């Protein structure tokens, strides 16, 4: 098989995992469907990188040191059912960025320096997994889960949680009733509704009452 340097390969699988790449591997084959490019050192993505990868239906890209995503980076990736950007330093991502990605079944990104929900992850319809664990959320905008109706697993935990703020009612809601979705991280998923907790008094997010939050309270 077909493969770049530091990186093995079987099939259409190119497993460049931990192996110090500073930057996306030249050269990956074009026939490729699953890429592993985690627990690695790659500081940016070059405009148009993965443009060439159209069969591609998993793509991990975790434990780098990625700030940002070039405009439309996974647009070819219309095959694409799974995408992790985990442990990165990712704070804004582009508006557009997953509009062509209606194919997402997972979508991982807990230890980033997100302070939203993305933008575009509401319209995801086929999620089943979803993790924005240990990032900088303070609330989910309304409506924005009430299409993914798909969803076995999300993931909320390590967020400051503004449970002052009236804006978190739908979050909290949200928990409330889809508790045997809701999961920690042990190591492996382990399903527990109490793990998003309200910043400051660490009080799980379902369990707040409506009449203890405000609308004057959300800056
Ligand atoms: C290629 C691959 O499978 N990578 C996985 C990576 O996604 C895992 O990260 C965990 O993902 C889940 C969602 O499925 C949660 O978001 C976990 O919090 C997350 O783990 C976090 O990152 C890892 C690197 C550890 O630092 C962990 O302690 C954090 O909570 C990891 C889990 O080990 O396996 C992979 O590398």
């Not at 050192?41 to 591609?56: A, H, R, W």
């Not at 995408?83 to 079944?105: C, E, I, M, Y």
Request: charged share 20%; aromatic share 6%; with cysteine.
């Amino acid at each position: 098989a077909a493969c770049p340097s530091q990186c093995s390969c079987s099939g259409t699988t190119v497993d460049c995992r931990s192996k110090r790449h500073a930057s996306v591997p030249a050269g990956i084959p074009t026939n490729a469907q699953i890429l592993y490019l985690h627990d690695n050192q790659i500081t940016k993505l070059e405009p148009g990188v993965f443009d060439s990868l159209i069969n591609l239906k998993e793509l991990y890209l975790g434990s780098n040191q990625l700030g940002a995503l070039p405009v439309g980076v996974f647009d070819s990736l219309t095959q694409l059912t799974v995408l992790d950007l985990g442990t990165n330093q990712l704070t804004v991502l582009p508006s557009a960025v997953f509009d062509r990605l209606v194919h997402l079944k997972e979508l991982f990104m807990c230890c980033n320096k997100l302070t939203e929900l993305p933008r575009g992850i509401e319209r995801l319809t086929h999620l089943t997994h979803l993790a924005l664990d240990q990032n900088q959320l303070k609330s989910i905008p309304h409506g924005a889960f009430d299409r993914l109706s798909s969803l076995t697993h999300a993931y909320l935990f390590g967020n400051p949680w503004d449970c002052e703020c009236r804006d978190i009612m739908y979050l909290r809601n949200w928990v409330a009733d889809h508790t045997s979705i809701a999961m920690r991280w042990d190591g492996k998923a382990v399903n527990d509704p109490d793990s998003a907790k309200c910043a400051g008094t660490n009080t799980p997010v379902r369990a707040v009452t409506e009449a203890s939050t405000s609308p004057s309270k959300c800056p």
